[PDB]
Design an enzyme around this catalytic site. Structure first.
Site, PDB file in Angstrom:
ATOM      1  N   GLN C  19       0.803  -1.221   0.000  1.00 57.58           N
ATOM      2  CA  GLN C  19       0.000   0.000   0.000  1.00 57.58           C
ATOM      3  C   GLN C  19       0.846   1.287   0.000  1.00 57.58           C
ATOM      4  O   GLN C  19       0.337   2.363  -0.322  1.00 57.58           O
ATOM      5  CB  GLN C  19      -0.920   0.008   1.227  1.00 57.58           C
ATOM      6  CG  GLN C  19      -0.169   0.175   2.545  1.00 57.58           C
ATOM      7  CD  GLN C  19      -1.069  -0.007   3.752  1.00 57.58           C
ATOM      8  OE1 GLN C  19      -1.289  -1.130   4.211  1.00 57.58           O
ATOM      9  NE2 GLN C  19      -1.622   1.097   4.255  1.00 57.58           N
ATOM     10  N   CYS C  25      -5.036   0.592   3.455  1.00 56.73           N
ATOM     11  CA  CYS C  25      -5.079  -0.808   3.875  1.00 56.73           C
ATOM     12  C   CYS C  25      -6.499  -1.386   3.804  1.00 56.73           C
ATOM     13  O   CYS C  25      -6.677  -2.556   3.482  1.00 56.73           O
ATOM     14  CB  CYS C  25      -4.560  -0.948   5.302  1.00 56.73           C
ATOM     15  SG  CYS C  25      -5.160   0.405   6.399  1.00 56.73           S
ATOM     16  N   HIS C 163      -5.600  -0.974  11.715  1.00 55.97           N
ATOM     17  CA  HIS C 163      -5.047  -1.553  10.493  1.00 55.97           C
ATOM     18  C   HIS C 163      -5.887  -2.676   9.872  1.00 55.97           C
ATOM     19  O   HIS C 163      -6.090  -3.717  10.483  1.00 55.97           O
ATOM     20  CB  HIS C 163      -3.642  -2.080  10.779  1.00 55.97           C
ATOM     21  CG  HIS C 163      -2.903  -2.528   9.557  1.00 55.97           C
ATOM     22  ND1 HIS C 163      -2.955  -1.839   8.364  1.00 55.97           N
ATOM     23  CD2 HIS C 163      -2.033  -3.549   9.364  1.00 55.97           C
ATOM     24  CE1 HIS C 163      -2.145  -2.413   7.491  1.00 55.97           C
ATOM     25  NE2 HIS C 163      -1.575  -3.452   8.072  1.00 55.97           N
TER      26      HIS C 163
END
Lengths: 4, 41, 174
Positions: C19, C25, C163
């Protein structure tokens, strides 16, 4: 890497 | 000794070929089960 | 459920992507899960366009490189009626104007399923569905510099996940  | 096989998106050099073994059945470690979903196809 | 699961063994997972310096993400996690489900449906593994998600899912709630949610991306695919292949819409690591082209669409979905917030439920989903999108607390140097073995961080949280990643299986070490 982040960004959730 | 249990773990979740996780695929990351930081390239294949990070961790284990871009993957990480994350502690499983350890009180929802790092919230891995707190926002899990999948698309219906 | 089985003792061990590894969807990589069955052709459900594409090579690892990067990324870069962009908080996209959520889009990678989303394409990862869609890639797995489309393969299960059609028998063909095709890399999906994260850029498509980054540039076009603003209406659904995402913030491009500033963050987002996998569920919002799935909603975008459904609203949009499709999602372009990685090949047709390459990753740029920065937000741009939406350039979706239906001719290059190779995936689609009819909504999404939010798994109950329990590890036992996640295990059943991974075992019966395939790769699953998840969010984890990766806000620690221990995660950034993770090398091998089972990752365990005492200061990890189950509330501030920051995340988005993809669970492609589970198992145990000897």
């Amino acid at each position: 890497x982040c960004x959730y | 000794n249990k773990y979740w096989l996780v695929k990351n998106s930081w390239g294949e050099e990070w961790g284990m070929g871009g993957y990480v073994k994350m502690a499983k059945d350890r009180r929802n470690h790092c919230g891995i089960a707190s926002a899990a979903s999948y698309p219906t196809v | 459920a089985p003792r061990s699961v590894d969807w990589r063994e069955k052709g459900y997972v594409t090579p690892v992507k990067n990324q870069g310096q962009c908080g996209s993400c959520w889009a990678f996690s989303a394409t990862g899960a869609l890639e797995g489900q489309m393969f299960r449906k059609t028998g063909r593994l095709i890399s999906l366009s994260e850029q498509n998600l980054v540039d076009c899912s603003g209406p659904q709630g995402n913030e491009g490189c500033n963050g987002g949610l996998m569920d919002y991306a799935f909603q975008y695919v459904q609203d949009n009626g499709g999602l372009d292949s990685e090949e047709s819409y390459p990753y740029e690591a920065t937000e741009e104007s939406c350039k979706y082209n239906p001719k290059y669409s190779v995936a689609n979905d009819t909504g999404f399923v939010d798994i109950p917030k329990q590890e036992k439920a996640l295990m059943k989903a991974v075992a019966t569905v395939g790769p699953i999108s998840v969010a984890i607390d990766a806000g620690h140097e221990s995660f950034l510099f993770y090398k091998e073995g089972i990752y365990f961080e005492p200061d990890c949280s189950s509330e501030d996940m920051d995340h988005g990643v993809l669970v492609v299986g589970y198992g145990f070490e000897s």
